[PDB]
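Fill in residues.
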């Protein structure tokens, strides 16, 4: 749908909160911490300090506040008090906060302790795949073009794009239309218009594209057990570009992108 300025104002708030959860949690992502504790830290911050709520907690049956996906876990990794992070791990923490009725959805990769060459590369390339997509967002561009660009970039770096999961519209709803595929598909025919709000969250595997759902029904792993990485931002299409609503202090892309 198309958001009104009033709606967007609220999404800036929700987006900022979600981004601040990732900024706040970064220092905590080190060797020895459990994903369960990280989840608790995020939730306590969201509820007690931001006076907001995790959109993930309870969503479609999800049992935790954030999704934490380590190494080969592609997405929806369930925080676990017994799962400890260690040197070299690449970890995605996907956050979604609701505030004043609107959602802010974002994720980033954290590398624990000493990064491995491939781990740093996969994360960097993945973030750049998101950045290149964000730099294309403007009225008139077709979402299919963005998916094509992401895939082309990722595969040229020897990595694969997960097909199953995609970006999504967002607002009062967590996952609204349209679907934002991260690969070229004729199924995609959406011309961007001002006011549209959605996410871009490419999941990239170091190995093959195939994935598999684990026994908990949420955790997804690469079929070949290769490393996987993902970054995500929620944006609003502006009259001549876009505004990243979940920009962080560490992001290396501007919040307001304009074309012409
Ligand atoms: O439900 C999804 N993600 C969640 N993260 C935390 C709680 S729920 C999700 O990505 N769903 C998509 C796959 C099916 C429909 C869209
Ligand atoms: Co999800
Ligand atoms: Co997300
Ligand atoms: Co999302």
């Amino acid at each position: 749908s198309i958001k009104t300025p009033e709606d967007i104002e609220k999404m800036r708030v929700a987006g900022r909160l979600a981004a601040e959860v990732l900024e706040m949690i970064e220092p905590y992502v080190k060797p020895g911490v459990s994903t369960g504790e990280l989840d608790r830290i995020c939730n306590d911050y969201i509820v007690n300090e931001q006076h907001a709520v995790s959109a993930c907690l309870g969503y479609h049956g999800y049992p935790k506040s954030v999704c934490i996906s380590i190494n080969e876990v592609v997405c929806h990794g369930i925080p676990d008090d017994a799962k400890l992070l260690k040197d070299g791990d690449i970890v995605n923490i996907d956050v979604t906060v609701i505030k004043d009725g609107f959602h802010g959805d974002t994720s980033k990769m954290f590398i624990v302790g000493k990064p491995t060459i491939m781990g740093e590369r996969l994360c960097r390339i993945t973030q750049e795949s998101l950045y290149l997509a964000l730099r294309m967002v403007k009225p008139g561009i077709n979402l299919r073009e963005i998916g094509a660009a992401i895939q082309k970039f990722v595969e040229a770096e020897g990595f694969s794009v997960v097909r199953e999961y995609c970006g999504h519209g967002i607002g009062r709803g967590f996952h609204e239309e349209p679907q934002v595929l991260h690969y070229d598909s004729r199924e995609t025919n959406v011309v961007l218009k001002p006011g549209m709000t959605f996410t871009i969250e490419p999941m990239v595997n170091a190995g093959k594209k195939e994935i598999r759902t684990m026994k908990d029904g949420w955790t997804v792993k690469t079929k070949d057990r290769s490393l996987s990485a993902q970054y995500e931002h929620t944006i609003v299409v502006t009259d001549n570009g876009c505004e990243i609503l979940t920009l962080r202090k560490d992001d290396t892309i501007p919040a307001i992108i304009s074309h012409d």
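The chain is about 25% helix and 25% strand.
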